[PDB]
Amino acid sequence: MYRVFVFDLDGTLLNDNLEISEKDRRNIEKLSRKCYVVFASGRMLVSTLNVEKKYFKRTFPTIAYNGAIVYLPEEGVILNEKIPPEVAKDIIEYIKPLNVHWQAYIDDVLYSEKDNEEIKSYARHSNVDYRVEPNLSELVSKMGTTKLLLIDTPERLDELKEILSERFKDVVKVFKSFPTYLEIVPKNVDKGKALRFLRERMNWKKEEIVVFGDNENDLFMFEEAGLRVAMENAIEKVKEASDIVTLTNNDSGVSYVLERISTDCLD
Ligand SMILES: [Mg+2]
Numbered sequence: 001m002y003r004v005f006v007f008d009l010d011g012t013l014l015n016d017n018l019e020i021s022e023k024d025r026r027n028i029e030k031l032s033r034k035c036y037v038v039f040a041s042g043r044m045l046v047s048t049l050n051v052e053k054k055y056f057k058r059t060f061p062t063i064a065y066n067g068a069i070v071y072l073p074e075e076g077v078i079l080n081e082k083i084p085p086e087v088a089k090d091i092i093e094y095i096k097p098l099n100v101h102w103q104a105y106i107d108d109v110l111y112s113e114k115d116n117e118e119i120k121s122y123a124r125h126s127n128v129d130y131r132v133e134p135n136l137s138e139l140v141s142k143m144g145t146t147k148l149l150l151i152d153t154p155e156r157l158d159e160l161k162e163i164l165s166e167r168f169k170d171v172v173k174v175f176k177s178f179p180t181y182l183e184i185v186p187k188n189v190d191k192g193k194a195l196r197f198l199r200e201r202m203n204w205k206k207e208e209i210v211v212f213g214d215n216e217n218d219l220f221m222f223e224e225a226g227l228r229v230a231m232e233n234a235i236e237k238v239k240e241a242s243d244i245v246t247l248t249n250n251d252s253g254v255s256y257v258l259e260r261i262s263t264d265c266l267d
Pocket of ligand 1: 008009010011012214215
């Protein structure tokens, strides 16, 4: 039997309109009684906890920033991976002379040096609030950051990616999230390491854990679970590593399999 249920949000529990169907909501509600529910997302911690409170008036053990943050409703953040203020300072001092548009994620708040069109459109599309801080260099250099993000034309961004990777590949992870978004994040952090950490903390055993995913990012969690469910919309690689491929996230792919799994709770 299974007693721990891990769900990615985007492309999984959330449909393409970023909402959770009533069917999936009700099934989670039933499990949450007596059993453990875990949400794992690449989104900010606040954004993730907000979805939790919106559909369920509470919070659950949570994996945010794709593994950098592990949160427990009672303890709060018990894992907080970030770019060390040193490598962070080096990156900022290196990047500024290059006149680019960068923003920083600090203590769960998105900051941008200048209030331009780049930031406006990014916060809009990845729906999050941001704050303009001209002195962001000092904020980061002295407070540390979960991650940095550069926004430019796919052209210049492909070039920036090139030089920042060659220069910092050794102490940080640099990759394009999309044609116009370049991200810099803590080296070896991912959803799998975060889930394994949570497991050690909570004393979960792999055999009682189920994970639902659709991502390359979620593939890491699969190694830490006893049962693996890929969404029908998952990339080919994820489906081939799963045990079962349920319906799409636009339907209630989660419920479709969730209702058939051998589980404690619900008696
Ligand atoms: Mg996803």
